């Protein structure tokens, strides 16, 4: 490629943490907002980091931390066919999602101030200078998937999250499963899986910045999922980032062309990566990979002259 091995390696680095305790302080301040609100006293819930910070795939220190505030004493379920809540001894919920969200908003408002809480479509932004909290908060309910492994046992399920965007469309994710699977792949690749994620994100940004290629449907989450689908041998068998990226692009192109991409899941394994309601298409990813291939000049220009 046109980039040195030193340059590529720099672009694999985790984003610097200019706070040392940013994740810690952020989780702790949000937890404090909830725990001191008496209206949560009888509720069970978890405050945890998801997205790029939860996966250690963040490439910019300035980016916002995604914090899930997940209710678990009331939850949603996916059952095997023909089963209902009463087959598992459950009610339809002692609190609705909107009631829970409004409690969360009150707690966050009391902690951070009404002018520093903004409700977006899929998250609540906290911009608190006083407590140094810059975070996207996702209030969710735990989602108990009993169907995936066909569990009739109330305590055996795959754990996800579910919430309703501000337009009331349903969103189901499996952030903890995603995190666990990404840790596993990192362990199997000598920590090079997440390094590869980070350098491909930085190269996407560089292609946009330098007017080579721009496609708003190529999200960071998509890039992480694409790289998670690269077989470990393409990461473990090479001695340079140049060659690792080269083989990654060859593999993704081949997999779109031979339709095997249709079996790829997101990192959680719980949804397919490509389908008709994703923001991206296979054409988008083909274009992205082709553009990266050209940007990196894996086909060297004539006489090494651009």
Ligand X SMILES: O=c1ccn([C@@H]2O[C@H](COP(=O)(O)OP(=O)(O)OP(=O)(O)O)[C@@H](O)[C@H]2O)c(=O)[nH]1
Ligand Y SMILES: O=c1ccn([C@@H]2O[C@H](COP(=O)(O)O)[C@@H](O)[C@H]2O)c(=O)[nH]1
Which residues of this chain interact with ligand Y, rule CB under 6 A?
A: 51, 66, 122-123, 136, 138, 171, 173
**Which of ligand Y, ligand X, Mg ion, none is residue 128 near (CB under 5 to 8 Å by kind)?**
none
Q: Which is nearer to Mg ion, 1 or 55 (CB)?
A: 55
123 binds, among ligand X, ligand Y, Mg ion, none (CB under 5 to 8 A by kind): ligand Y
Query: Least distance in Å: CB of 136 to ligand Y?
Result: 4
What residues make contact with ligand X under the rule CB under 6 A? 50-52, 63, 66, 173, 219-221, 224, 279
Taking the complex as a whole, how short is the minimal distance between the CB of residue 144 and Mg ion, in angstroms?
25
User: Does 66 interact with Mg ion (rule: CB under 5 A)?
Assistant: yes
What is the smallest separation between the CB atom of 47 and ligand X, expressed in angstroms?
A: 16
Residue 75 vs 163, nearer CB to ligand X: 163
Cβ nearer to ligand Y, comparing 176 with 249: 176
Nearer to Mg ion, 134 or 147 (CB): 134
Query: Which CA distances in Å does 105 have to 44, 69, 269?
Result: 17, 11, 32
User: Encoding tokens for residue 13?
Assistant: 């680095």
Taking the least distance from each CB to ligand Y, the nearer of 3 and 143 is: 143
Shortest distance, position 77 Cβ to Mg ion, whole Å: 27
CB 142 within 8 A of CB 75: yes
The residues binding Mg ion (CB under 5 A) are 51, 66
């Amino acid at each position: 490629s046109k980039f040195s091995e030193s340059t590529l390696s720099g672009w694999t680095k985790p984003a610097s943490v200019t706070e040392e305790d940013r994740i810690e302080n952020t989780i702790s301040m949000i937890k404090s907002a909830i725990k001191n609100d008496n209206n949560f006293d009888n509720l069970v819930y978890e405050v945890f980091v998801q997205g790029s910070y939860g996966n250690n795939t963040n490439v910019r220190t300035n980016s916002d931390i995604d914090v899930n505030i997940m209710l678990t004493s009331t939850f949603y379920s996916k059952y095997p066919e023909g089963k209902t809540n009463s087959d598992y001894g459950f009610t339809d919920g002692t609190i609705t999602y909107n009631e829970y969200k409004n409690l969360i908003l009150t707690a966050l408002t009391n902690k951070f101030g009404t002018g520093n809480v903004t409700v977006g479509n899929k998250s609540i932004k906290i911009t608190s200078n006083s407590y140094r909290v810059e975070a996207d908060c996702i209030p969710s309910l735990l989602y108990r998937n009993y169907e995936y492994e066909n569990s009739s046992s109330p305590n055996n399920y795959i754990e996800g999250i579910k919430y309703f965007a501000s337009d009331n469309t349903s969103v189901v994710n499996y952030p903890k499963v995603h995190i666990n699977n990404g840790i596993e792949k990192n362990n199997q690749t000598h920590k090079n899986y997440k390094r590869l994620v980070r350098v491909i994100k930085r190269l996407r940004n560089k292609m946009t910045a330098e007017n080579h290629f721009t496609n708003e449907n190529i999200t960071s989450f998509l890039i992480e999922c694409l790289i998670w689908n690269v077989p470990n041998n393409y990461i473990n068998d090479y001695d340079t980032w140049d060659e690792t990226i080269k083989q990654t692009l060859i593999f993704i192109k081949s997999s779109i062309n031979d339709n095997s991409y249709k079996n790829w899941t997101e990192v959680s394994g719980m949804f397919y990566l490509f389908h008709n309601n994703r923001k991206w298409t296979s054409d988008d990813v083909s274009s992205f990979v082709n553009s990266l291939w050209s940007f990196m000049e894996y086909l060297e220009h004539h006489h090494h002259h651009h």
